[PDB]
Scaffold this motif. Structure first.
Motif, PDB file in Angstrom:
ATOM      1  N   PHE A 182       0.461   5.953  19.924  1.00 61.00           N
ATOM      2  CA  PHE A 182       1.492   4.769  19.444  1.00 61.00           C
ATOM      3  C   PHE A 182       1.883   3.692  20.578  1.00 61.00           C
ATOM      4  O   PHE A 182       1.494   2.231  19.345  1.00 61.00           O
ATOM      5  CB  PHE A 182       2.709   5.393  18.724  1.00 61.00           C
ATOM      6  N   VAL A 205       0.857  -1.161   0.056  1.00 62.02           N
ATOM      7  CA  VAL A 205       0.312   0.018   0.119  1.00 62.02           C
ATOM      8  C   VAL A 205       0.578   1.205  -0.034  1.00 62.02           C
ATOM      9  O   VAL A 205       0.287   2.434  -0.500  1.00 62.02           O
ATOM     10  CB  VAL A 205      -0.947  -0.232   1.128  1.00 62.02           C
ATOM     11  N   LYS A 252      -6.806   8.475  14.474  1.00 61.20           N
ATOM     12  CA  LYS A 252      -8.034   8.721  13.821  1.00 61.20           C
ATOM     13  C   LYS A 252      -8.267  10.161  13.699  1.00 61.20           C
ATOM     14  O   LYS A 252      -7.886  10.874  12.766  1.00 61.20           O
ATOM     15  CB  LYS A 252      -9.041   7.514  13.541  1.00 61.20           C
ATOM     16  N   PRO A 278       0.892  11.811   7.872  1.00 64.58           N
ATOM     17  CA  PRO A 278      -0.182  11.470   6.422  1.00 64.58           C
ATOM     18  C   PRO A 278       0.202   8.984   6.252  1.00 64.58           C
ATOM     19  O   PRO A 278      -0.675   8.491   5.459  1.00 64.58           O
ATOM     20  CB  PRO A 278       0.053  11.989   5.639  1.00 64.58           C
ATOM     21  N   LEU A 279       1.012   9.106   6.085  1.00 61.76           N
ATOM     22  CA  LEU A 279       1.628   7.587   5.398  1.00 61.76           C
ATOM     23  C   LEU A 279       1.464   6.736   5.746  1.00 61.76           C
ATOM     24  O   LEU A 279       1.143   5.079   5.799  1.00 61.76           O
ATOM     25  CB  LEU A 279       3.170   7.482   4.718  1.00 61.76           C
ATOM     26  N   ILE A 280       1.434   6.871   7.755  1.00 66.74           N
ATOM     27  CA  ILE A 280       1.533   5.781   8.724  1.00 66.74           C
ATOM     28  C   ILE A 280      -0.277   5.755   8.378  1.00 66.74           C
ATOM     29  O   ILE A 280      -0.055   4.142   8.311  1.00 66.74           O
ATOM     30  CB  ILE A 280       1.855   6.665   9.812  1.00 66.74           C
ATOM     31  N   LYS A 281      -1.002   6.364   8.903  1.00 66.75           N
ATOM     32  CA  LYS A 281      -2.307   5.628   8.354  1.00 66.75           C
ATOM     33  C   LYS A 281      -2.979   5.605   7.636  1.00 66.75           C
ATOM     34  O   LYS A 281      -3.579   4.309   7.389  1.00 66.75           O
ATOM     35  CB  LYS A 281      -3.591   7.268   8.770  1.00 66.75           C
ATOM     36  N   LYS A 282      -2.982   5.617   5.976  1.00 60.70           N
ATOM     37  CA  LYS A 282      -3.200   4.887   5.047  1.00 60.70           C
ATOM     38  C   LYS A 282      -2.358   3.478   4.606  1.00 60.70           C
ATOM     39  O   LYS A 282      -3.355   2.570   4.331  1.00 60.70           O
ATOM     40  CB  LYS A 282      -2.602   5.543   3.700  1.00 60.70           C
ATOM     41  N   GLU A 283      -1.108   3.169   5.652  1.00 59.08           N
ATOM     42  CA  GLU A 283      -0.438   1.573   5.690  1.00 59.08           C
ATOM     43  C   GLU A 283      -1.300   1.472   6.632  1.00 59.08           C
ATOM     44  O   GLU A 283      -1.563  -0.455   6.672  1.00 59.08           O
ATOM     45  CB  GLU A 283       0.723   2.242   6.517  1.00 59.08           C
ATOM     46  N   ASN A 332       0.574   8.435  23.739  1.00 64.07           N
ATOM     47  CA  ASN A 332      -0.910   7.846  24.100  1.00 64.07           C
ATOM     48  C   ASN A 332      -0.249   7.222  23.041  1.00 64.07           C
ATOM     49  O   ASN A 332      -0.721   6.179  23.253  1.00 64.07           O
ATOM     50  CB  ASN A 332      -1.248   9.092  24.573  1.00 64.07           C
ATOM     51  N   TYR A 391       6.340  10.405  30.123  1.00 65.97           N
ATOM     52  CA  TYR A 391       5.627   9.427  29.947  1.00 65.97           C
ATOM     53  C   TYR A 391       5.953   7.969  30.886  1.00 65.97           C
ATOM     54  O   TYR A 391       6.837   6.703  30.210  1.00 65.97           O
ATOM     55  CB  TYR A 391       5.610   8.727  28.611  1.00 65.97           C
ATOM     56  N   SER A 398      -5.111  20.480  19.134  1.00 62.90           N
ATOM     57  CA  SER A 398      -5.616  19.625  18.024  1.00 62.90           C
ATOM     58  C   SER A 398      -7.116  18.125  18.816  1.00 62.90           C
ATOM     59  O   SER A 398      -7.166  19.207  20.371  1.00 62.90           O
ATOM     60  CB  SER A 398      -4.466  18.326  17.502  1.00 62.90           C
ATOM     61  N   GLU A 399      -7.542  18.372  18.187  1.00 59.94           N
ATOM     62  CA  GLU A 399      -8.707  17.748  18.652  1.00 59.94           C
ATOM     63  C   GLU A 399      -7.845  16.698  19.684  1.00 59.94           C
ATOM     64  O   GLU A 399      -9.239  16.148  20.245  1.00 59.94           O
ATOM     65  CB  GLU A 399      -9.952  16.949  17.292  1.00 59.94           C
ATOM     66  N   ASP A 453      -1.978  19.622  12.812  1.00 64.52           N
ATOM     67  CA  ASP A 453      -2.040  19.282  14.309  1.00 64.52           C
ATOM     68  C   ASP A 453      -0.101  19.276  14.332  1.00 64.52           C
ATOM     69  O   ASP A 453       0.187  20.131  15.454  1.00 64.52           O
ATOM     70  CB  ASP A 453      -2.313  17.926  14.999  1.00 64.52           C
ATOM     71  N   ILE A 484       0.543  12.506  20.992  1.00 65.45           N
ATOM     72  CA  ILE A 484       0.805  11.602  20.398  1.00 65.45           C
ATOM     73  C   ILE A 484       1.762  10.157  20.750  1.00 65.45           C
ATOM     74  O   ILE A 484       1.535   9.242  19.772  1.00 65.45           O
ATOM     75  CB  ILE A 484       1.645  11.830  19.423  1.00 65.45           C
TER      76      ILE A 484
END
Lengths: 179, 87, 212, 238, 70, 153, 49, 208, 50, 212, 238
Positions: free
Chosen positions: F90, C73, F98, F147-152, F88, D232, F29-30, F104, F86
């Motif tokens: 991963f 992908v 998501k 942007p690449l991590i979410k699509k992967e 948290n 953390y 950020s949200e 952000d 961030i």
């Protein structure tokens, strides 16, 4: 409790073996740059004779300072269940721990995938009959605490009348931890 | 007609690059047997590099074997893994 | 890595996938690699006007993966960005230091030759793809082997080679050129086409197989 | 080129590593009398009970062997007047020096570089286990003879295998790993013990080439670098 | 986008087929042309049904995605 | 399934001059909003030891930026929340990744550069800047890789 | 007879007249060894009008 | 949900065999198996078309009904006027892929034509559309920046784009769209603490 | 590499047109450039007329 | 599979089984294949006129299975009733596309050449048995090696072999045709019996051994 | 052909495989000095007390070996004017292209076609284990001699193993079984467990080219589908 005793309980081998493997697998840590043995070993799709096996109370320390393989053998209850390590064809690139009922059953025999090979790939062969293994009476005793002089029915063997003529009263006994 | 075969072994390692490790391959053995309670394999390596200082114990080695020719479009073009284990 | 293709008259989309992979069924992956809509190829070029980026026609160029990166992908994502610029990912981008090829070719092996320069305005000149590869062979070969202040065994022995003009010495110059040029992974191989010994001028010309 | 009526004959020369770096460049004054080149293949044949199976593994190590005699009459040299006996002795001494210095498994420097000035071909070569056999029989009392056998490593056109400069785009030496390791060295023993506990807890909760751009392999390095600038947990994770 | 039952497709197909010639009009069950056209109309019918089902599933999935009410 | 948090960090996280190159916007950020509410309402487990003498331990609380420049102290909290948000997802519970997007992290770095430049004037408190510059390049790698991590995945 | 289209190396999808297909043809025919024919040889034209 | 090649082809051969006894050969090169394969492959194409169209509907269709449109990356485009030295005498030919470059040193942008255009012998001024060679906002350019044509035909005097290109929209993931839609949907709540608080923020002087 | 532990093995004898069935319990691979590439297939519980 | 045979003057049914299968014992199962009533073979045709379909007499054909299919009950049932329809089923039935036999032999190695036809009434034409083989061979031979949309490496390079008519080209064509023909497992071997030249025209013929 | 009664013989030719599609060939200007063909048999004979036992296992590899040289005269070619030296160099380069990147990389051709126009015989061959052997000698100052050994894959008239088509009458894929797998994908855990139990129950009480025409091989496959869709038990049987 307080002591290091741990008890595993399940009504089948796949239930017990899940608890046995899951108890120690995560904490077995190593220096892999990417995970541990649980990612590389699926140890899933396990099954056994759930209907004939009752509830089990298999103890952690059944073997004095033994290995998990020694404790894995007790859970397996061989030869009624077949345990081995083999490549995962369904998921190439990683290994799989197999624990399934023995394929000598008729329908389970048909469930195994077939593989063809003609004589054109044969370099040498050494195959023949043998009478090294020969038994007449077969029985599956329950866990060795129960004993004929202090309780309920001890055992219930089976034999063929024609077979015992050549080999008389040749017994074959196996203890099954489950029953 | 007689079949033609062109074997092409690959090796991948995860903790030195695996592709350089596979290049110095010479031969290996893979004893796997349900009769005994232990599966064991052996690998022969060339002496070009000092492997004693490199390959730390307990590493994982993956072996891939090419059965027959790629472009022929034979069923053997599958890069099926033959064995994986811990040194 | 990848291969180029040029769309032919009434070319069947499935014929591409078969022609380069043997099975037909990988055309689903190929069209995802090229960000096509359902009209994968069309005869009429006026139809492309409506959705040019997502609609290809005769004579257009498509990108063919190699088999290993077919179902990745991430490769599909990157191959959806670098459409007909994918060369740039293999050969790379680097700074221009060949300010005038009219200068250094007349001075040759020496200190104090090449320099950074500026194309256009404000943005420093970055030289890319095949033009990066030109520079990264040229600037390599002009450097003497020992020279650079980290990772030695850069460069070439070329400056040693100004011996007697007799034929053996000419082949020695061929050998060092071949040795120097095949030393970078971006070139598969090299070989000599021709050479010409003038009274004191060596001239010779060499092929190199740049990848892609 | 050979003597073909278009160009005059040209004769073989061998380049050797000079022990101070650079090279010596020896050349023969009479060419070989016999010249043989072998190209063995690693193909094997096994006979199954119903079919023959042909299997190949590719090209095998080539062998170069040739035999000749050094000329008798004196012949001028590019820096002297050397006779055939001096030439043969020089050859024996080069060969002895190259063989003897190889007592560390293999020379880190050059193999011998061979130029076939007669038929256009070039090789990189090593002394075969036959070695430099020198003899002088009753026949031709004043002429020496030499027998040399070599094994081919590869074409001289191609540079060394390990020395090839790889792509190396992005960064092969990431700073994230380095500063993570420095952080963890700087941590207190209790800090690392708690980090080990947190790692073990996470492992329990599992169930029941590098580039900052267009690459995911280095994702963990950016995350591993965190959990130390931000607390953390009493120590980092993974 | 509407269902069309096998026999409707098959009839439209044979009706179109008979245009321009009259050396085909024999469609007993034994005929092979009938079998082929029955198989094509079966596949088209299945396509329509699966299309309609997949449309419904897409509607459901969009309803999931829009308001995040999994 | 959450690792307990240090007492220091938990207390820290629960609540003119201007630079010419980078400026802040005080935008959250949200994903950072959702975490803040979780910590505000639910009683997350917390540790009792404080062995790790790094990060905000005797550096962010020791400095006089808390009393002198409270507005600047609000930037530092936002960066910690965005840095802790961030980290948290991963490490654990990736379902919250998501809501994160490119912008952000973009604004977070700009806020980092502004507070970092202001801290450069002070000669005592350069220790805080030492970690911020290392953290600054950490956000940029996520920015060019998120942007690449979410699509992967 | 025909008038074709060629992908000219500028990226230029050139629709091309018949006297230019004659060039493409004559070029190929000229380059081959003596005594070969254009008969059943392929040409790198894109599409035909 | 969706069938696949062998899935359909196998159905089709089975029905063919069952319906008639006149066909028994299904080797490679059979006209029947060929026809069946072409049918199956066509049907698979329709199935994938349906799948992609449903995917697009899931992504955009359900929310687009509220007048909110998604930004889609497209090539910058606009009208370009070409002037000739003198009035044409013969019909001139301008192939697709005719390429365009800007002589200004600050604008390395480039454009090209997608379709063939022709200039009639009687015409003297022609407007032709061009499309950028790069996606996004890189194609955008102010008026009068090309000044040149790559085809070198000496009839052309000067070239220039009459209007700036602004159609090179950027790529925005659906996450931001979904976020903004949810924010709009939550702002319509009435008689709630958070909604009342939000509504007090409209006045510029109301902060705390 | 097709042969694996626990897999059912079918053999067809061309010598006399016979058929054999087996159950795999062990496999031992051997790869070396010096002489070909072999693979042992241990079998048990074999019977004819498959 | 099977072998053909005919009833000879006063040959007994015992004699056949013994000569082909060795043991006389097998005649008993062998009569069921030929669906014969007790008078299994009878000399006179006016005696066959008793009930013609259930007997064989002098000059009639017989069916002779291979020994593996001798014991199969399905082979018995099929051979009982199908009789002459054996050959057709055993070598296949499919649509006839050799509509224009005069025509396809004017443009081979060009496309669009074959077409459905009509025989009988209201049904597409079909071919069977030996002619099934003549069709498929002729089409397959006249198809280029990678032009069917699935299972490529089907066809020939006959469109590629046009050359200077020197004999090496003719042997090359011979070998391609032989490879072409021997591809189908149903054909045992092919061999050339003549190759012949007429200036710019090749001519030749091949003998193919089709299984019984 | 030979020189006898018929017109002039045709030399021996070698056909190699072109990387880029198509084929390239090599014809010898000078016929070989020696031409040997070995066709052994794989058979062993072992006598018992009073009888002789003969066993055979097919035809052995037919080994082809021949030795030739290259002329010193030039001769016309299809392109250019190539002398014997260039001819032998091209032969060497072709063999090295077929051998060096055989086990490594990839070669398009799977085999080599060996044409004996003089002997009127054809075979498909592969490089032997002995491999190519080139040698030049005293009493041949201008010439070049080659020695090659080959192993015959098989007759050239037959088709390739991978390019063979079986009978394949009727459907080759049993669509019922293949869609039973598909219907099973959807089933609930309890349905599968009951399926397994029913299968066990049937199993423990037993002893006490898909074409529905002219065959019964695909019987149970159609039953499974029908039992699955209709529902014999919670999951099904068989």
């Amino acid at each position: 409790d307080g002591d290091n005793e741990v008890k595993f309980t399940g009504s089948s081998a796949h239930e017990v073996m899940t608890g046995i493997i899951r108890r120690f697998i995560p904490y077995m840590k190593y220096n892999y740059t990417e995970n541990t043995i649980d990612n590389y070993l699926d140890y899933d799709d396990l099954s056994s004779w759930d209907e004939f096996e009752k509830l089990t109370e298999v103890s952690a320390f059944t073997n004095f300072d033994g290995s998990l393989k020694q404790l894995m053998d007790m859970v397996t209850a061989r030869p009624f269940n077949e345990l081995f390590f083999k490549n995962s064809e369904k998921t190439p690139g990683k290994a799989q721990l197999v624990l399934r009922k023995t394929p000598f059953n008729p329908t389970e025999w048909r469930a195994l995938d077939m593989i063809k090979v003609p004589t054109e790939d044969f370099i040498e062969e050494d195959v023949g009959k043998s009478d090294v293994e020969t038994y007449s009476i077969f029985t599956a005793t329950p866990a060795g605490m129960l004993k004929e002089l202090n309780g309920d029915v001890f055992s219930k063997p089976q034999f063929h009348p024609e077979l015992t003529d050549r080999y008389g009263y040749t017994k074959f006994e196996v203890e099954n931890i489950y029953l | 007609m007689r079949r033609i075969r062109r074997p092409k072994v690959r090796i991948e390692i995860v903790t030195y690059n695996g592709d350089e490790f596979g290049a110095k391959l010479l031969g290996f053995q893979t004893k796997n047997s349900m009769e005994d309670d232990s599966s064991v394999f052996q690998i022969n390596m060339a002496g070009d590099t000092y492997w004693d200082k490199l390959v730390m114990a307990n590493d994982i080695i993956r072996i891939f074997i090419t059965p027959n020719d790629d472009p022929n479009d034979k069923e053997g073009k599958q890069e099926r893994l033959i064995q994986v284990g811990m040194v | 890595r990848f291969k180029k293709h040029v769309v032919q008259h009434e070319e069947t989309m499935q014929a591409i996938a078969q022609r380069y992979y043997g099975d037909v069924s990988y055309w689903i992956d190929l069209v995802e690699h090229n960000n096509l809509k359902y009209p994968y190829l069309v005869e009429t070029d006026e139809e492309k006007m409506k959705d040019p980026e997502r609609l290809a026609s005769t004579g257009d160029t498509l990108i063919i993966p190699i088999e290993s990166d077919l179902t990745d992908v991430s490769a599909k994502e990157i191959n959806s960005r670098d459409k007909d610029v994918l060369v740039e990912l293999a050969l790379g981008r680097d700074l221009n230091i060949t300010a005038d090829e009219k200068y250094f070719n007349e001075h040759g092996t020496s200190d104090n030759i090449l320099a950074f320069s500026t194309n256009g305005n404000g943005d420093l000149d970055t030289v890319k793809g095949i033009d990066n590869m030109k520079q990264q062979l040229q600037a390599r070969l002009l450097t003497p082997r020992g020279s650079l202040m980290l990772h030695p065994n850069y460069g070439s022995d070329l400056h040693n080679l100004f011996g007697l003009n007799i034929p053996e010495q000419a082949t020695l110059i061929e050998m060092e050129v071949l040795r120097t040029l095949t030393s970078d992974n971006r070139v598969k191989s090299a070989n000599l086409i021709d050479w010409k010994i003038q009274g004191n001028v060596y001239s010779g010309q060499f092929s190199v197989e740049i990848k892609s | 080129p050979q003597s073909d009526g278009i160009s005059n004959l040209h004769r073989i020369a061998l380049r050797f590593p000079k022990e101070g770096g650079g090279y010596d460049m020896y050349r023969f004054k009479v060419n070989p009398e016999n010249y043989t080149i072998d190209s063995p293949q690693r193909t094997t044949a096994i006979k199954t009970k119903s079919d023959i199976v042909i299997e190949d593994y590719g090209k095998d190590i080539e062998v170069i062997n040739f035999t000749g005699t050094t000329g008798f009459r004196p012949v001028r040299e590019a820096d002297g007047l050397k006779t055939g006996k001096q030439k043969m002795e020089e050859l024996q001494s080069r060969v002895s020096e190259y063989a003897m210095q190889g007592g560390s498994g293999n020379v880190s420097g050059s193999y011998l570089q061979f130029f076939n000035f007669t038929d256009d071909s070039y090789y990189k070569v090593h002394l075969a286990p036959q070695g430099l056999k020198i003899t002088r029989s009753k026949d031709e009392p004043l002429l020496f003879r030499y027998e040399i056998t070599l094994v081919v490593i590869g074409s001289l056109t191609e540079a060394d295998r390990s020395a090839v400069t790889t792509e190396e785009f992005g960064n092969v030496k990431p700073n994230a790993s380095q500063r993570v390791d420095e952080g963890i060295k700087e941590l207190d023993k209790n800090a690392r013990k708690t980090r080990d506990r947190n790692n073990q807890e996470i492992s329990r909760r599992e169930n029941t080439i590098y580039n900052p751009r267009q690459s995911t392999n280095g994702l963990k390095g950016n995350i591993d670098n965190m959990a130390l600038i931000i607390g953390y947990g009493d120590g980092g994770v993974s | 986008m509407k269902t069309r039952k096998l026999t409707n497709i098959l009839s439209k197909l044979i009706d179109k087929t008979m245009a321009g010639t009259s050396k085909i009009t024999d469609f007993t069950p034994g005929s092979a042309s009938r079998s082929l056209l029955e198989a094509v109309s079966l596949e088209i019918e299945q396509f329509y049904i699966l299309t309609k089902e997949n449309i419904d599933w897409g509607i459901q999935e969009g309803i999931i995605e829009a308001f995040d009410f999994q | 399934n959450f690792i307990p948090q240090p007492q220091g960090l938990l207390r820290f996280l629960n609540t003119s001059f201007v630079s010419k190159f980078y400026t802040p916007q005080l935008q959250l950020s949200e994903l950072a909003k959702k975490v803040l509410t979780n910590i505000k309402t639910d009683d997350i487990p917390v540790l009792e030891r404080e062995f790790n003498d790094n990060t905000i331990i005797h550096k962010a609380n020791d400095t006089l930026l808390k009393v002198q420049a409270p507005r600047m102290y609000m930037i530092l909290q936002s960066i910690v929340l965005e840095a802790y948000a961030i980290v948290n997802c991963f490490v654990e519970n990736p379902s919250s990744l998501k809501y994160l997007t490119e912008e952000d992290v973009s604004i977070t770095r700009e806020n980092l550069n502004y507070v970092a430049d202001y801290l450069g004037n002070y000669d005592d408190y350069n220790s805080v800047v030492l970690d911020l510059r290392d953290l600054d390049l950490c956000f940029s790698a996520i920015e060019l890789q998120l942007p690449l991590i979410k699509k992967e995945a | 007879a025909n008038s074709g289209t060629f992908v000219m190396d500028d990226g230029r999808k050139n629709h091309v007249p018949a006297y230019m297909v004659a060039v493409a043809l004559g070029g190929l025919a000229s380059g081959l060894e003596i005594g070969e024919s254009i008969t059943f040889k392929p040409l790198r034209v894109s599409s035909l009008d | 949900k969706t069938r696949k090649l062998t899935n359909i082809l196998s159905k089709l051969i089975d029905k063919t065999m069952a319906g008639t006894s006149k066909i028994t050969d299904f080797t490679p090169g059979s006209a029947s198996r060929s026809l069946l394969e072409a049918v199956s492959l066509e049907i698979e194409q329709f199935y994938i078309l349906t799948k992609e169209n449903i995917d697009w509907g899931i992504q955009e269709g359900i929310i687009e009904a509220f007048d909110f449109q998604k930004r889609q990356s497209k090539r910058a485009y606009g009208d370009v006027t070409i002037q000739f030295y003198q009035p044409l005498d013969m019909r001139m030919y301008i192939p697709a892929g005719t390429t365009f470059t800007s002589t200004r040193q600050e604008y390395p942008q480039q454009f090209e034509t997608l379709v063939d255009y022709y200039a009639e012998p009687d015409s003297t001024e022609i407007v032709v559309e061009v499309y950028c060679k790069e996606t996004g906002v890189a194609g955008n350019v102010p008026e009068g920046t090309i000044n040149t044509i790559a085809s070198g035909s000496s009839l052309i005097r000067s070239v220039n784009n009459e209007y700036s290109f602004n159609t090179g929209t950027k790529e925005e993931s659906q996450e931001d769209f979904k976020r903004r839609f949810h924010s709009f949907v939550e702002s319509r709540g009435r008689a709630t603490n958070k909604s009342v608080r939000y509504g007090a923020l409209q006045i510029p002087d109301v902060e705390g | 590499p097709k042969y694996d532990l626990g897999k059912r093995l079918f053999i067809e004898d061309k010598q006399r047109g016979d058929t054999w069935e087996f159950y795999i319990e062990s496999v031992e691979h051997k790869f070396d450039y010096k002489q070909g590439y072999y693979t042992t297939v241990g079998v048990t519980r074999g019977l004819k007329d498959a």
